[PDB]
From a paper:
The Csy complex is composed of four Cas proteins including Cas5f, Cas6f, Cas7f and Cas8f in a stoichiometry of 1:1:6:1, and a 60-nt crRNA that integrates all these protein subunits. Consistent with previously reported structures, the Csy complex adopts a helically twisted ‘G’ shape with Cas5f, Cas6f, Cas7f and Cas8f protein components integrated by the crRNA. Target DNA binding and R-loop formation induce conformational changes in the Csy complex, enabling it to recruit the Cas2/3 nuclease for degradation of the invading MGEs. Here, we report the cryo-EM structures of three type I-F Acr proteins, AcrIF4, AcrIF7 and AcrIF14, bound to the type I-F CRISPR–Cas surveillance complex (the Csy complex) from Pseudomonas aeruginosa.
The 124-residue AcrIF14 from the Mcat5 phage is a comparatively large AcrIF protein and is divided into two domains. There are two AcrIF14 molecules bound to the Csy complex. In contrast, the N-terminal domain (NTD, aa 1–80) shows no direct contact with the Csy complex and is built as a poly-alanine model because of resolution limitations in this region. Two copies of AcrIF14CTD interact with the thumb domains of Cas7.4f and Cas7.6f, respectively, mainly through polar interactions. R84 of AcrIF14CTD forms hydrogen bonds with the carbonyl groups of S89 and S92 of the thumb domains of Cas7f. In addition to the thumb domains of Cas7.4f and Cas7.6f, AcrIF14CTD also interacts with crRNA, reminiscent of AcrIF9 (22,23). Y89 of AcrIF14.1 packs against A(16) augmented by a potential hydrogen bond between E91 and A(16). The pi stacking interactions between Y89 of AcrF14 and the crRNA are sequence independent and will likely be maintained with different crRNAs. A comparison between the Csy-AcrF14 structure and the Csy-dsDNA structure suggests that AcrIF14CTD competes with target DNA to bind the crRNA and the thumb domains of Cas7.4f and Cas7.6f. Simulation of AcrIF14 binding to other Cas7f subunits shows severe steric clashes, explaining why AcrIF14 selectively binds to Cas7.4f and Cas7.6f.
Numbering used by the authors:
A (entry chain J), F (entry chain K): 80 to 124
B (entry chain B): 3 to 224, 239 to 322
C (entry chain A): 8 to 434
D (entry chain I): 24 to 358
E (entry chain H): 24 to 252, 258 to 358
Write the structure that this text describes.
């Protein structure tokens, strides 16, 4: 289960939250900010 | 040394420009030797008149502010200096960096002697307070609390209690009074056993390196910082001999010619800033003088701590 | 171990110095090459170097970091080990002594001459020990070798009667019986140089830089690294740091003092709850230190029993610390401001009655003081335990295991101590 | 032979504190214990070049290229609030006492000779010319350094503080008491006898000095400026940093002390300056020139040697200056 | 030989304060002591590219690619409220006096010569031409820098403040008084005589200058702007305590804008009195040292070798001494 | 375009910054510190 989800056309990064079963808005940015956040935090929770 | 018969509390004392340079390796709070020498100067100036022996000192430090400034783009700090006068030609003199800091400490100094029975407790408390108002604590003037809301007075707690409960009760009363500070104690046994564990880790390790390891925030791989028990700091724990002890009228340009001189060098121990109600015995947490002059090793510590 | 190899080595050093001076000379006339080849090439170089020894001195503890118009004595003395355990300084340096040099900056050729490791050891170390290959390379007859040996040894010996200037520090010490020792301390340049080297490899060393980068990559490095926060830089020479010492040119000033600071060295100001949302946000009123401390409480979830003994000890002293700074925050609010009774309303969480200790008795004589001395409001421990119960994770396996039982018993002991200190507020 | 002691050191008597400045409105100065503090804040200054050019930067192409690039700082500034026209500067001062006894002296013969010389001076003429001038420099608010030069009215309140409460209160009009004339007054002489009894006695006499000045609404006040070397590397930093103890602007204690020591009217150069600070080889920092040079026989060291060693007692003005140095402090001694 | 002193420092005469700007409605300017402040708030901006391309960027595909990614900033902006059309800018100004005396001087001979020079200036002609121009720059609201350039009506109220109260009040139409002509009036000459008696040291002068600019509802006002070292925060405005303000040195530069004697034409008008008299907006230094008309050559010829300049040039020299600075070499 | 500018009477060294078109405050000092900084960093940017 992926920790971050980039909404691609809308330039928003959604980070998974475990309390409610959903993604919440983390920050703006595209694929580069998504990959940088994956490198920092690690994907797959 | 000997245990205190009473425990005088000098109140919150404001010191305006104390020596923030404790040692060649440490900056920050002044050396505990300043406080032990201050208490011995108090004994030298009123203790011979009130027939008491002021000995030992508990350092509390309600607030502290080093006159420092972090420069732009650096992680380190520098010291705000003073402007010394010019020379006889008008040239700017060579700047010698002195650290200055504003302290608010209170001194738990132990008192014992035959003067406790001769005078009232508030009388000798007011006497040593009126003497300490005209003194200096680490090179910094003692600010004497004029025209504020109310002067913080003294309370000479008698260490001899009628019970264990009365002893703990007025000890808790005193600890509530010196509560917004942080008591400074000498923790050399922890430094020694940290030397032993670090020598088990890699051999021929100095306790200089164990001290440095206890200071730094070192990181560990799985990343996690190393936990530290309490607020561990490096302190200068006295002096060690570099020279044979010279005769009084033998060394050139001494302070006086009736005192033997010996060129010495600092000894860096370890201290721990803890809240004062952790110790459960305020008869402890007092900094004494241990010379052993035949070997060198002029040092100060808090004996009877643990 | 042959004197001929030592002789051609020192003549190579002399001619290297000569070609260096003629290369940085930029000469085209005036015939300074004749004087340079007469003085800086032959065995006269050894004679003027043996003359120039007496300006220099090998030292470990100099006076010049204390106010630089201090013509006192400097010492090459290594102190004996303290018999008492714990404390240490500059007697740890057995083979790692760097041996600072003081004196004139013009006569450094004597030091760079004497510091050489020609055979396998130091030239002063070969010249102090009487041997065969010593006393023969820098000579043709014996007596000039004698006087040049007694010249080259004396760079480690003090010059003049022992003296410390009026600008130097001299501090009395109370002896146990009576009387004093005058104790003039000196600046340890060797110890400062060793700690400066250690801090330089700790901050700018490549083995530290690699682990610092691997922390950012979040990969596992073999070793770790350190940071040393809150260092203070202290410079000794003002604009000419060379006039103090030799090792004061490696570290250009820059004493690099370690922080010895009380924990209240960052002044935190006071904030009392006023409104309803201020009573909501300022009941706990939590500083960055307690969040840093409870972040470590959340990092104590897993436990193996042999480690969990020390982990439970750490949790015991940790909850003692969180009680300590809770009582500290309450004390500094209760003495600092009258803001707990600044303005009334309906929402202040008034059941606390610990953050307003002089705000209810020194103003209201029988209205709130008799409503607090007989009631003895100390009930903040169970609400603080409810707040502290968040610090552990709400895991079903964590509550089903006995770790929650150990957590609750140590928490109950520490809230009992918080109760015992919180009850005695009427004395 | 009675040579000079190799370690001489006198502790600083007349020890002031850091002069905290706070602000409020005039004609409610008596309720000025809850006046809010003057705070040090940041502002950006941008200037053109105004220095003298070094005769190679006087090409008008180079000048017009230089003034298109201004020079930007971020200075510290301390202003009064926009609804407060009075600066309240409030420091304390301990007059310690034992003014002749050195903190360090080598030769006990020289120490007893110096104590005999000082007691000869005190029994001859006590601290009554010196404490009158110290009471003047407390009376006119000279410690208000640049906060005094454009004030409408300066009023200085001095309170002698006994064990916990005021023992005696003064009040001066600091603009009427000039900056250059050490005249006579009843309250000034009462303060002079108090500072004399401080400097002569064994215990300390404590004074609380408060000074108000009408500057104007929102005008700039001048706290002490910090001497920081190593301003920074490769970034943009502060060019001017103001002293502030606890989020509250302040004058350094040594600046207040330099204002209090400004009593020396006896230096042999003409008094185009007026009084200067008491210093050995008396050297005004702003002037950059050291009066009382050792070329003449009128500095501190040669006067002290002639007074103590060979008993050549100088004029009463010069020995006023010598005892003023002994109250000032200092670290003396040869190799 | 009388060379120049190695230190000279003149204090700043004409000390202004931070000019606080608040906002309300015109025709109740006389009840404008409780007007709410103009608060500096933030807003977002999008820019397209608009600078010149350096002929490597003139690829059309590269230009469209740079246009598709615009720069986002967050600027600080200060506006009037939507129901307020008048900007009240208020500051106080201290005219100190003792203009020729330096705060620091090494050479006592040079100090005495400079004091004699300024004394024969003041005796030959007072601080009357300079205070006329300083009273003009108070009267026409030049210290309203960009808040003045499109205002319907500007009105300045200058109160001389004695002990606690207004000793004498002035009131001007700041658009009738131009930004370029230093003419005569009764009230301007009264204010000029007040500033003259201040600069001569013959009185304590503290003014309270309040200026109302009638801009329009909700329009943009321009407080002073600070230096910054997507949310790039490209603009920061100066505000003392949640209330926009002009820097005191900007009011000081607008008060010093009296120099109409520079050797170039008078179609530009008055500039600020500076050594090597320079306007950074025009990028050009009038009073260049190639001509003999900067502050330093005029002062070094007037004081050292007694070459008194023209009367307007010594007006400029004494205006620079009123301005302050460090003159003298290393 | 000069990299350092000494403000001569006021003992301040201003170093040119390229982001904004202006000089910023670098350090204190006079002609000697200016020449030493020119020797270290090189003038003319």
């Amino acid at each position: 289960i992926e920790k971050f989800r980039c909404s691609h056309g809308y330039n928003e990064i959604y980070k998974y939250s475990p309390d409610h079963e959903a993604y919440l808005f983390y920050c703006k940015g595209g694929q580069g900010q998504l990959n940088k956040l994956i490198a920092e935090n690690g994907r797959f929770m | 040394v000997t245990d205190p018969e009473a425990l005088l509390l000098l109140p919150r004392l404001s010191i305006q420009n104390a020596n923030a340079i404790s040692s060649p390796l440490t900056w920050g709070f002044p050396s505990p030797g300043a406080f032990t020498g201050f208490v011995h100067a108090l004994q030298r100036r009123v203790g011979i008149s009130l027939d008491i022996e002021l000995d030992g000192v508990g350092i509390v430090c309600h607030r502290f502010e080093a006159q420092i400034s972090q420069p732009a783009g650096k992680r380190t700090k520098v010291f705000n200096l003073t402007r010394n006068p010019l020379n006889r030609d008008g040239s700017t003199a060579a700047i010698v960096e002195e650290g200055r800091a504003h302290l608010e400490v209170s001194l738990l100094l132990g008192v014992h002697g035959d003067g406790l029975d001769d005078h009232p407790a508030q009388e000798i408390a007011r006497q040593v307070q009126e003497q300490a108002g005209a003194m200096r604590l680490a090179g910094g003037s003692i600010l004497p609390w004029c025209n504020e809301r109310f002067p913080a007075p003294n309370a000479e707690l008698l260490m001899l209690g009628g019970s264990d409960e009365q002893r703990r009760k007025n000890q808790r009363r005193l600890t509530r009074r010196l509560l917004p500070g942080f008591a400074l104690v000498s923790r050399e046994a922890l430094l020694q056993q940290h030397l032993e564990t670090l020598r088990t880790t890699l051999p021929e390790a100095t306790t200089l390196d164990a001290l440095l390891d206890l200071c730094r925030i070192n990181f560990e791989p799985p990343w996690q910082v190393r936990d530290k028990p309490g607020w561990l700091v490096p302190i200068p724990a006295g002096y060690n001999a570099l020279s044979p002890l010279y005769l009084p009228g033998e060394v050139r340009n001494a302070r006086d010619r009736e005192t033997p001189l010996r060129f010495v060098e600092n000894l860096f121990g370890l201290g721990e800033w803890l809240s004062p109600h952790r110790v459960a015995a305020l008869s402890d947490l007092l900094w004494y003088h241990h010379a052993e002059p035949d070997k060198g090793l002029y040092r100060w510590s808090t004996p009877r701590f643990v | 171990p042959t004197w001929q190899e030592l002789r051609q080595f020192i003549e190579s050093f002399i001619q290297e110095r000569l070609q260096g001076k003629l290369d940085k000379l930029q000469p085209d006339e005036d015939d300074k090459r004749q004087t340079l080849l007469a003085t800086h090439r032959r065995e006269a170089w050894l004679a003027d170097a043996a003359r120039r020894v007496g300006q220099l001195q090998l030292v470990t503890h100099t006076l010049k970091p204390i106010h630089p118009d201090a013509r006192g004595s400097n010492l090459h003395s290594l102190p004996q080990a303290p018999g008492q355990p714990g404390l240490a300084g500059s007697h740890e340096l057995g083979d790692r002594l760097v041996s600072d040099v003081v004196g004139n900056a013009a006569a450094l050729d004597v030091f760079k001459f004497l510091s050489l490791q020609y055979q396998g050891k130091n030239l002063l170390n070969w010249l102090t020990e009487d041997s065969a290959e010593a006393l023969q390379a820098l000579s043709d007859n014996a007596e000039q070798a004698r006087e040049w040996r007694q010249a080259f040894i004396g760079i480690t010996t003090v010059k003049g009667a022992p003296a410390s200037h009026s600008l130097a520090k001299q501090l009395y010490f109370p002896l146990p019986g009576s009387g004093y020792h005058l104790l003039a301390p000196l600046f340890p340049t060797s110890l400062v140089h060793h700690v400066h080297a250690l801090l330089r490899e700790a901050r700018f060393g490549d083995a530290a830089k690699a682990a610092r980068e691997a922390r950012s990559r979040q990969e596992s490095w073999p070793h770790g690294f350190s940071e040393y926060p809150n260092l203070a830089i202290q410079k000794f020479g003002g604009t000419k740091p060379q006039n103090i010492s030799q090792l004061n040119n490696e570290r250009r000033g820059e004493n690099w003092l370690l922080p010895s600071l009380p924990p209240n060295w960052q002044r935190q100001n006071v904030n009392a709850p006023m409104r309803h949302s201020s009573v909501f946000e300022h009941d706990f009123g939590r500083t960055p230190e307690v969040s840093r401390l409870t972040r470590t409480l959340q990092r104590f979830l897993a436990k193996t029993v042999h480690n969990n003994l020390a982990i439970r000890q750490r949790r015991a002293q940790l909850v003692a610390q969180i009680c300590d700074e809770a009582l500290q925050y309450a004390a500094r609010l209760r003495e600092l401001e009258p803001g707990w009774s600044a303005t009334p309303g309906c929402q202040l969480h008034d059941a606390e009655q610990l953050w307003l200790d002089p705000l209810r008795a020194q103003t209201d004589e029988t209205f709130l003081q008799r409503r607090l001395r007989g009631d003895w409001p100390a009930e903040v421990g169970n609400r603080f335990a409810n707040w502290l119960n968040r610090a552990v994770s709400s895991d079903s396996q964590i509550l089903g295991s006995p770790e929650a039982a150990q957590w609750s018993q140590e928490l109950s002991k520490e809230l009992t101590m918080f109760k015992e200190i919180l009850e005695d507020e009427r004395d | 032979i009675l040579s000079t002691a190799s370690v001489l050191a006198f502790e600083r008597k007349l020890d002031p504190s850091d002069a905290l400045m706070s602000a409020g409105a005039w004609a409610q100065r008596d309720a000025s214990q809850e006046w809010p503090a003057v705070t040090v804040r940041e502002k950006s200054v941008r200037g053109t070049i105004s220095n003298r050019l070094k005769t190679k930067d006087r090409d008008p192409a180079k000048l017009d290229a230089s003034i298109q690039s201004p020079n930007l700082q971020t200075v510290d500034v301390a202003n009064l609030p926009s609804d407060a026209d009075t600066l309240k500067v409030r420091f304390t001062l301990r007059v310690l006492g034992g003014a002749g006894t050195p903190s360090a002296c080598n030769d006990a013969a020289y120490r007893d000779k110096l104590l005999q010389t000082v007691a000869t001076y005190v029994n001859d003429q006590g601290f009554a010319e010196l404490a009158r001038r110290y009471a003047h420099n407390l009376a006119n608010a000279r410690f208000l350094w640049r906060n005094r030069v454009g004030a409408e009215a300066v009023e200085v309140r001095i309170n002698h503080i006994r064990q916990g409460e005021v023992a005696r209160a003064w009040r001066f009009d600091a603009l009427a008491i000039g900056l250059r004339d050490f005249k006579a007054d009843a309250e000034l002489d009462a303060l002079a006898e108090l500072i004399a009894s401080g400097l002569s006695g064994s215990g300390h006499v404590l004074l609380e000095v408060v000074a108000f000045a009408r500057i104007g609404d929102g005008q700039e006040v001048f706290p002490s400026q910090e001497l920081i070397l190593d301003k920074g590397d490769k970034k943009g930093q502060k060019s001017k940093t103001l002293y502030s103890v606890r989020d509250a602007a302040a004058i350094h204690s040594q600046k207040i002390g330099n204002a209090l020591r400004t009593i020396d009217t006896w230096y042999p150069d003409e008094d185009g300056l007026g009084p200067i600070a008491v210093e050995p080889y008396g050297s005004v920092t702003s002037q950059g020139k050291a009066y009382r040079q050792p070329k003449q026989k009128l500095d501190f060291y040669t006067l002290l040697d002639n007074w103590v060693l060979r008993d050549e007692a100088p004029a009463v003005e010069q020995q006023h200056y010598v005892i003023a140095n002994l109250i000032r402090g200092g670290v003396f001694g040869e190799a």
